[PDB]
Design a protein around this ligand. Structure first.
Ligand code: NA
Ligand code: NA
Ligand SMILES: [Zn+2]
Ligand SMILES: [Zn+2]
Length: 257
């Protein structure tokens, strides 16, 4: 389950489909009017995402938007290629926009110092902004800290009349380059703290974590064969991601002293 490894795609819930790699989440939100892709995985993983969208029975030219959680190489590395294959517009938090256009992180970024291909057609979303495509409506929530422009994305998908609130959860992890210190960046720390609070408040029936194992994707999926898509449903999921971020940050800060 490497960041770039092939992964047979699958429906998570209604029109929410997993099209990512074995190690990085990418989600296709489909409609007869066109689709929204969330994240591009790695540069190598772009080929997997492209193959996966087609294996689900969709056309790449019908993807009108690519949404970015945060601009690290493992989630955004493949966005440039996906943008080229689709002609989509790329949407990101204001502070990660330039990282996505160029491929180079800002010095503030905990993982500043690897690069990746820059993408055309990037523009910023506002916190709370609604991204619209036909019947689709995806809301941006600023969740900074792991990066400054981190966005967690929410929508609803309905399966056989049963509608659920879906959250594509950006990373809330206090991890960085080996030389970076969260102890030296109190505003980054304060951002992460705000984000835990913001995420655990989200209406959250189905959580898809940018790192899929953060909400047990592989386990839930295996169970999905037996009990159907209710296996991905767990409304404590966003609270659990936030709690794990919180505990992880306390651990990181202590270890840095
Ligand atoms: Na694949
Ligand atoms: Na973003
Ligand atoms: Zn990251
Ligand atoms: Zn990552």
């Amino acid at each position: 389950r490497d960041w770039s490894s092939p992964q047979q795609p699958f429906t998570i819930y209604g029109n929410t489909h997993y099209v990512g790699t074995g190690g990085i989440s990418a989600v296709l939100l489909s409609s007869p009017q066109g689709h929204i892709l969330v994240d591009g995985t790695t540069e190598k993983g772009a080929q997997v995402v492209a193959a996966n969208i087609r294996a689900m029975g969709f056309k790449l030219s019908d993807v009108k938007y690519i949404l970015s959680t945060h601009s690290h190489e493992d989630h955004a590395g493949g966005i440039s290629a996906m943008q080229k294959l689709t002609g989509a517009t790329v949407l990101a938090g204001a502070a990660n926009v330039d990282t996505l256009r160029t491929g180079v992180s800002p010095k503030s970024d905990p993982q500043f110092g690897s690069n990746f291909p820059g993408s055309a057609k990037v523009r910023a979303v506002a916190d709370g902004e609604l991204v619209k495509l036909g019947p689709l409506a995806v809301k941006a929530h600023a969740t900074p800290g792991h990066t400054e422009g981190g966005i967690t994305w929410t929508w609803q998908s309905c399966e056989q009349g049963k509608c659920k609130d879906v959250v594509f959860a950006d990373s809330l992890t206090a991890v960085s380059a080996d030389s970076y210190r969260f102890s030296d960046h109190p505003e980054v720390v304060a951002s992460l703290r705000g984000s835990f609070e913001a995420v655990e408040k989200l209406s959250c029936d189905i959580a898809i974590a940018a790192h899929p194992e953060v909400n047990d994707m592989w386990t839930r999926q295996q169970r999905a064969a037996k009990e159907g898509n209710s296996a991905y449903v767990d409304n404590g999921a966003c609270r659990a991601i936030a709690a794990a971020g919180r505990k992880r940050l306390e651990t990181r800060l202590a270890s840095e002293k």
